[PDB]
Amino acid sequence: HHHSSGLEVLFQGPGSEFATTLPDGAAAESLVESSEVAVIGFFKDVESDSAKQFLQAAEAIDDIPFGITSNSDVFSKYQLDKDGVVLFKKFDEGRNNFEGEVTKENLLDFIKHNQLPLVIEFTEQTAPKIFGGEIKTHILLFLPKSVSDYDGKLSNFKTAAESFKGKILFIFIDSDHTDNQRILEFFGLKKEECPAVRLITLEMTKYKPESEELTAERITEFCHRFLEGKIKPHLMSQELPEDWDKQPVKVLVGKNFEDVAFDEKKNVFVEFYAPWCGHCKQLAPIWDKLGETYKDHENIVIAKMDSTANEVEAVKVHSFPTLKFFPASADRTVIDYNGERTLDGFKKFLESGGQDGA
């Protein structure tokens, strides 16, 4: 029903491919209830400049349903005295009114800014957005579902979130679950240490709070301190295995990284990798062949480090695999490698003294 017209189509303005025409209050309620976020343009004249700017906004966005209405009873239903645009949502304030000049770009900005909840649970449903987001600073509340005062601690987290609307994205994650364990590891946390709060910048470090308390005020202080660069970059290390240097490719962890990497008398080539990463798996036999070629060399060292389980300060890695060259010198220079991930490309780079290949 809400997806077909009767004969009203004979005497009303032409509809749009990109927004659902809403004849009445029932149609509007159904549109809002159909999705987590919905937007309705209230335009008496669907053919006006302002309404068309709205329809252009609707055309450009794929994951939010747009509705449009010219019925005064519907305007009234949503406390509208005149033409306007309203975003609806099944969380927080439940509704946001657009203000300013109705243009495609102003509308797109309006949607983007009010579309996301104050606090977002991390799941495989929410993950794509959180990872493809524009806000490049995140705070994670590791909140176990078994733990008591779940509602309370989440409420403290949401309260704190209000102070950083366009600056820090507030995310909470279920520590108890085994599917979230790699994220735990990546932040160097145990389920025992949780509930806890951690923060990450994606342009590229992690940070922990000074206090273990989870009050709105404590989380707020933590965030405010981070923004003032008052908190030092958080580091983590795996235990160095005794066989770290038994193979042609040397195993680095956080603890021994500086020792071998910035050895002044050694040309060190390091693979920073993720164990679960398909591309790292693909490179692995080639990287071993490179290690084998330079097993008995006088000054070239081939090495790797699991960058999901080790955080050093000299280098930051959010892309896997990443390859970096540490020439033999006192300067402690890092040369980025962007050549072909080939046995031959590595060799030519190594014998160049890491001169070329980007």
Swiss-Prot record:
Effect after changing residue 237 to A: Abolishes phosphorylation at this site but protein is still phosphorylated at other sites. No changes in chaperone or enzyme activity
Record keyword Acetylation present: yes
GO annotation, cellular component aspect: cytoskeleton; cytosol; endoplasmic reticulum; endoplasmic reticulum chaperone complex; endoplasmic reticulum lumen; endoplasmic reticulum-Golgi intermediate compartment; external side of plasma membrane; extracellular exosome
List of residues that carry Phosphoserine: 211, 237, 307
EC numbers for this chain: 5.3.4.1
Annotated S-S bridges: 277-280
Membrane-topology descriptor: Peripheral membrane protein
Localization per record: Endoplasmic reticulum; Endoplasmic reticulum lumen; Melanosome; Cell membrane
Residues of the Thioredoxin domain: 229-355
Active-site residues annotated for this sequence: 277, 280
Broad class of where this protein is predominantly found: endoplasmic reticulum
Record's keyword annotation contains Metal-binding: no
Stated consequence of mutating residue 307 to E: Phosphomimetic mutant. Does not affect enzyme or chaperone activity. Does not increase binding to ERN1
Top-level taxon in the UniProt lineage: Eukaryota
Site (Lowers pKa of C-terminal Cys of second active site): residue numbering on this chain: 341
GO biological process, alphabetically ordered: cellular response to hypoxia; cellular response to interleukin-7; endoplasmic reticulum to Golgi vesicle-mediated transport; insulin processing; interleukin-12-mediated signaling pathway; interleukin-23-mediated signaling pathway; peptidyl-proline hydroxylation to 4-hydroxy-L-proline; positive regulation of cell adhesion
Alphabetical UniProt keywords: Acetylation, Cell membrane, Chaperone, Craniosynostosis, Disease variant, Disulfide bond, Endoplasmic reticulum, Isomerase, Membrane, Osteogenesis imperfecta, Phosphoprotein, Redox-active center, Repeat, Signal
Site residues (Contributes to redox potential value), renumbered to this chain: 278-279
Modification N6-succinyllysine, positions: 104, 153
Modified residues (N6-acetyllysine): 82
Single GO MF annotation: protein-disulfide reductase activity
Subunit structure: Heterodimer; heterodimerizes with the protein microsomal triglyceride transfer MTTP. Homodimer. Monomers and homotetramers may also occur. Interacts with P4HA2, forming a heterotetramer consisting of 2 alpha subunits (P4HA2) and 2 beta (P4HB), where P4HB plays the role of a structural subunit; this tetramer catalyzes the formation of 4-hydroxyproline in collagen. Also constitutes the structural subunit of the microsomal triacylglycerol transfer protein MTTP in mammalian cells. Stabilizes both enzymes and retain them in the ER without contributing to the catalytic activity. Binds UBQLN1.
Family: Belongs to the protein disulfide isomerase family.
Leftover remarks: Reduces and may activate fusogenic properties of HIV-1 gp120 surface protein, thereby enabling HIV-1 entry into the cell.
Disease in which the protein is involved: Cole-Carpenter syndrome 1: A form of Cole-Carpenter syndrome, a disorder characterized by features of osteogenesis imperfecta such as bone deformities and severe bone fragility with frequent fractures, in association with craniosynostosis, ocular proptosis, hydrocephalus, growth failure and distinctive facial features. Craniofacial findings include marked frontal bossing, midface hypoplasia, and micrognathia. Despite the craniosynostosis and hydrocephalus, intellectual development is normal. CLCRP1 inheritance is autosomal dominant.
Name the UniProt record assigns to this protein: Protein disulfide-isomerase
Species this protein is from: Homo sapiens (Human)
Taxon lineage: Eukaryota, Metazoa, Chordata, Craniata, Vertebrata
Primary gene name: P4HB
